[PDB]
Design a protein around this ligand. Structure first.
Ligand SMILES: [Zn+2]
Lengths: 82, 75, 164
């Protein structure tokens, strides 16, 4: 609705590069907004946890260690049962 | 690498603001989040493309991305 | 480090009619005696737009868990077509086979499922009123997407300092 709501962290060319890197060949024009929405949820979840760890450590500065641990919550996805 | 850093850093800052005012990220922390975001989206697009292929389509759609978010684990 | 691990899943009857039950054989390993229950759930995604349209098809609750290699089969009833948005019914979706221990999810397996009419005429001109009896489903069994979560297994042996 307002400017702040529409602040983005990945550009449309970047979305296309990431898509090509993932093997995509053709895209709906609606994919840019979809991808941005999914990225914002991912970042909200990770940053929420990262901030929790930073606060418990009596810090105001978020460290890579906080981010690395928060990134484990998504689990590890692979093909097959190895 | 695939994501440019400054606009990404601003998004991270705005998001972090909604959780706690006056809280910076170390440059290495922002970098870690950027690298992870790239890896997340590339993997999501891999699953997205698979979904489309299985649907007998060559063009990915928003439904393919949402289904990929379910096929990888959701939550 | 996981006390229970999935070893494999066989999708037994595929392709199939939309109304056919889902047959799976699941094999897993349990490394040691566990206090609590495991629960395997099978869930059909009725709509990509919302979890509101998920249909849980089956569940098997096991406890205590026998040590060693374990096997079981689902023959799960199919989802209800009446509960799926008609516009999303004859299209690709996902099914999800998950497992929890003491209520903590530790593995999820997702498969794509395409749904397609079995007649050229219908595929070319799909009717507004869906014809369930003519839908064929095809699970992409050769590409399970397996996600593992590192959980706490024994509340007496280990403590999460940030529990939910
Ligand atoms: Zn007929």
């Amino acid at each position: 609705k307002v400017l702040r709501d529409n602040i983005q962290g990945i550009t449309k060319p970047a979305i296309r590069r990431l898509a090509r890197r993932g093997g995509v060949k053709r895209i709906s024009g609606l994919i840019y907004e979809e991808t941005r929405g999914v990225l914002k949820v991912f970042l909200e979840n990770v940053i929420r946890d990262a901030v929790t760890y930073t606060e418990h450590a009596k810090r105001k500065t978020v460290t890579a260690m906080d981010v690395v641990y928060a990134l484990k919550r998504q689990g590890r996805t692979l093909y097959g049962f190895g | 690498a695939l994501i440019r850093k400054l606009p990404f850093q601003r998004l991270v800052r705005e998001i972090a603001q909604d959780f706690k005012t006056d809280l910076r990220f170390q440059s290495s922390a922002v970098m870690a989040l950027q690298e992870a975001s790239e890896a997340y989206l590339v993997a999501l697009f891999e699953d997205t493309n698979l979904c489309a292929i299985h649907a007998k389509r060559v063009t990915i759609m928003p439904k393919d991305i949402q289904l990929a978010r379910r096929i990888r684990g959701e939550r | 480090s996981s006390i229970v691990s999935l070893l494999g899943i066989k999708v037994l009857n595929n392709p199939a009619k939309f109304t056919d039950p889902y047959e799976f054989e699941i094999t897993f390993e349990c490394l040691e005696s566990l206090k609590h229950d495991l629960e395997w759930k099978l869930t059909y995604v009725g709509s990509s737009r919302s979890l509101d349209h998920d249909q849980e098809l089956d569940s098997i609750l096991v406890g205590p868990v026998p040590v060693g290699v374990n096997k079981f089969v689902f023959s799960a009833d199919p989802p209800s077509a009446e509960l799926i948005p008609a516009s999303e019914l004859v299209s690709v979706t996902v099914i999800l086979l998950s497992c929890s221990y003491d209520g903590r999810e530790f593995v999820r397996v997702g498969y794509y499922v395409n749904n397609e009419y079995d007649e050229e005429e219908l595929r070319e001109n799909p009717p507004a009123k869906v014809q369930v009896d003519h839908i064929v489903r095809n699970i992409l069994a050769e590409k399970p997407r397996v996600t593992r979560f590192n959980i706490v297994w024994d509340n007496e042996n280990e403590g999460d300092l940030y529990p939910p």
